[PDB]
């Protein structure tokens, strides 16, 4: 039932950037164990590796214990890729690409109108000439933009040249991935070395400063999605000025204390917070009236 | 059924001062109880900040009790401000500013002509040399100043040099606010600290002594607000031979006992109390009689 | 019961190549000395030839002891093309044919419909413009197409004009016995004279090379599908040439270390693999799932 | 092991032509020596039990030594017959006819029942549309076919019309004698003039030469047949298509040279050699099976 | 004894006409002057006439000498007949019939057992419908019918209505004694008057000519019946078919050179010759076996 916070309502779309997270996948296909949990992603890819015969039943017991070894799942996942598969410079090496193509298909069938109303709002924000960044293996945004009649161009960390062009504010039609993409598993980075090899283009950290001070971001995700390791590293090594940052997260009006705690946590982080609702299909209408009223005020 | 007083009409406008409260805002935009009186603004903040989830339940109970209580408006304001403000003030901070922006919400949306005829009348006194001072966040004259082209700006707290030049009659057009500048919400000057913040520039009060002794003052839309502690301190600092002066007042009531007691306190201030304007038209017609001539061809 | 491979699922019918190994025709007739093994084929040919009074024991039983060597026998059988028939080749002689026509018997009667599922799948793929190669003398596919009411043509690597039309997808009416079909024994290409024949008609060599580079093959039967002598010679040179290409072969789970090392060697050549325990019944089931995918990609 | 070879088996009844050589008449009716060879035929001139063989006992011993000499016996038997019956020139007689008829009458108790199985086969194919022809001096087939119920007509090289009307496939229920037959004594020729009768009838030569290139000719008991000067005059003469005829001989095979020798010369003429196991009884077993296959393929 | 010589044995009773000189009686009884050859019948007729004292000395010398000299008997016998059988009213006599009664006396004792076998076989053929004609005026076959228990009707050309029924087969078991008969003196002739007596009924003449062209004729011991001008004039001198005529004669191998010489003479005349025996009994041994063939083929 909720309403425009004037700070946003007064901000112009020209100011804005957004982050994409789990809530879109949770609208589309929340039954999929992996899309709710990265230890569920380990289970799913372990099932596929067993179906492939990459590693034995005794290894399957060790990897089941790895499901129980929660936290730093980003690192555990890098290790599991490398345990299963080499990072070769040559050959379209098989089983791993197939394994992710199997996980990538048959999400598009699931797409709810709840997703379509987020997506239409999002597409208008994109059309306003913004920048967008994603945690998501899921790419529903790119495909559905084509159902809405439009191209979408998707970008990845190892395409560091396009990371730079996104940060330079140049690319319209644009989304950046931190993690998986349908293009090539080789794009993936998950151990800290892969991430920091991109960050070692240190001028990009100075463009992260420019954006993070100057513009206003809005985030979709678990909220812990800003707390995930490379998000912490990339943003916090770029900006020490917790005072001078300029940007928001979206949060669920479930338990009152979850959003209070998160609001204070983000305040302590140097980050801004807004709340909507518990339900995973209450967000779209809230987001729609919010979005068109911002873009029509920007007009 | 209403009349002018000869001593007011016989002064030259350079001789006159005016003091303004909520009834003029009710002439510009009667639409909200907040515009009729400050108590409605408490209900507006309560509604808005609950709708945000920026008021929690015990905070809401305090402000519900403020609506029961009606303390001195200084203490109402301080009570309201202090719980309304969530903060850790190293970061630039936000939420109370949005609450003001939604509670005010850009009153071009609520305009009416009867109030703007009052503004044009008072402003013409200022053209032939009159001065004006006022309580609230109601920048409404400044809306009409942008319509009428007599260049004007809103002053409170921080610019005592400019206040001195205007009180020193070096410039005719400026607007003086007294509660504190709304763009400093946690700061708001409705506290005992406001008495000492005026004392920082007793030289501004020295010109206000000169004005209050020499000039004749007209009081509009005011009430017990001018018997609240900040106005008591201002008046004691302005003159102590307090009864002797000539000043005029127009007011309405809840019951006649208010007007008996108010007329005694007004006369102790030097002020003569009159009643009309159950609806606006009495004041425009009183101003039509006071203007002498609309054609400007006889005199 | 077991997972399709996405990378294989991707391609159009027109895009794909299919090869019918000796294990596959042995699934078309799981009772047949002509198909059980090459050692069995030679043994049965010789023993059947003496059963018709065509030959004498001295050479035959001495070479039978040589069969215990299990090796060189493919070319020793071509040396037997000298030995076995009394020889003239311009006059329409019979004895070599008499053996191979005693061998090409029972035909359809041995087929399970389960094998016919695979053959029907092939027939619908060939209807969509696909292309079929086989290691086998035996036109059981063409006879099955006539059982389901329509012509297929039987074709040889000594009928190079029709091989070129077949290879360009034009002669989809025809099925290419790589070693030649039983019907005309002099035609046969398991003989090194047939390997030379692929060079003698350069268009055959070109079409093999062209098709490897341009398009993806799916290979079926046994390790011996790849390993048998003409396949080893022609097709392993094509993967001595290199472009990191993608191709497919079907295997049973078996000895997993041999399977792994084979899979590695195949990957090093440029081939991708599918592997399951307990042999036959899953191959028709899985192949039919793949067939409807390819069929829907055609339509 | 008495299995059936393919290339012969391919044919339906009308496609085939059957040559009944001297040994089959002997095999069909062995109760008198006279059938059993050309030495038997000449011996029959001596088997005469009446005074009017026109020779001396010393001339009889000379011609007995001609049987020891392996002489020009086809012509020498004619010369002997001309010396046995010099009536005047071409005038009528009884004595040759009396000898012949007394030898040749009463055939059906002189038969084998296994020989009646062979003749059953002959008749069965002939009614199913064959061509049947003989050298031999005996209507054995016609009399046995009358015992079966069939009113068979006997033909020879006197009425060239009847030879050709057999050749047209028209004379169902008829049998054709080339060297001649007893019931028509003045039609018999062992000398060249009988061969000259068909060489003169170029239309019969054209039928035999048509049957030679395209049709299949098969020969039974035929150790001499294909090497008869009469056969070479009747058959080969104009046409050299020997490389591409489709013709067949059966003989008992027990030494390797028997097939090798026979094959080489037969392939020079254009004919295909076939084994049977151990004795002549195997040949009616093979040929009766082949006959019911020819019938069932035809009808 | 003689083996069978089929060509004569073929003939049915109604296909048979038997030619009867004395020679049947010669073979039956070679010891009697009346029987040896037709000159012996005329000698016995002359002997009977001389015992009756009927004839002149110079006529008797003429007859005896002419019968020994092998002259043409027709005129010798006719002269004896007309001398004995004068033809007026008062100068008339029977004597030639009375001489026939003396000549053919006691023949049933005179017969050999071979001769009785011959006559039994002839009578058996006559009862089975065989046709018979005789130059003898005799009762000899009518006497052997009496031996057997049978009787026969005796005719000459001038008994023209009964001879027409004989000739038209209506009187089988009647016998025509061409030259006259023991029942009738006026008929008896061997002459152009005999050709007239054949003509005397033209239907009888036409039947007689028809027999020799159409039927088969058999001659036995015809040591003059070959030369009868009556038999010559129609059969030898007015039938053209001599090459083709299916006629038969039995002659005795008393010398093989007599048989060669007689074969030459008779086949030149138009008469076809068959050879038998050392002595006359060999003809009855064949003739009974032959008679059984004739009757069984006639049945």
Residue numbers in the entry:
A (entry chain B), B (entry chain A), C (entry chain C), D (entry chain D), E (entry chain E): 28 to 326
What does the literature reporting this entry say, word for word?
Here we identify family with sequence similarity 118 member B (FAM118B) and FAM118A—two understudied vertebrate proteins—as vertebrate-specific sirtuins with similarities to bacterial antiphage sirtuins. We show that human FAM118B forms head-to-tail filaments both in vitro and in living human cells, a feature that appears to be conserved in both FAM118B and its paralog FAM118A across vertebrates. While human FAM118B and FAM118A have individually very weak NAD-processing activity in vitro, their interaction leads to markedly increased activity, suggesting a tightly regulated system. As expected, the FAM118B sirtuin domain comprises the large Rossmann-fold subdomain and a small α-helical subdomain but lacks a zinc-binding module.
We recombinantly produced and purified full-length FAM118B (referred to simply as FAM118B) and its slightly truncated variant lacking poorly conserved and likely flexible terminal regions (designated FAM118B24–334), both with a noncleavable His6 tag. Subsequent cryoEM analysis confirmed the presence of filaments in both samples. Despite the apparent helical symmetry of the filaments, an asymmetric reconstruction approach produced higher-resolution densities than helical reconstruction, similar to what was observed for another filamentous systems, likely because of structural heterogeneity within filaments. Experimental models were generated by fitting AF3-predicted FAM118B monomers into the electron density maps and refining them to a good fit. The part of each FAM118B protomer that is well resolved in the density maps is limited precisely to residues 28–325 for both FAM118B and FAM118B24–334, indicating that the flexibility of N and C extremities extends slightly beyond the parts truncated in the shorter construct. Individual FAM118B protomers are arranged into filaments in our cryoEM maps. Both FAM118B and FAM118B24–334 structures show essentially the same assembly where each successive protomer is translated forward and rotated by approximately 40° around the longitudinal axis, creating a helical arrangement.
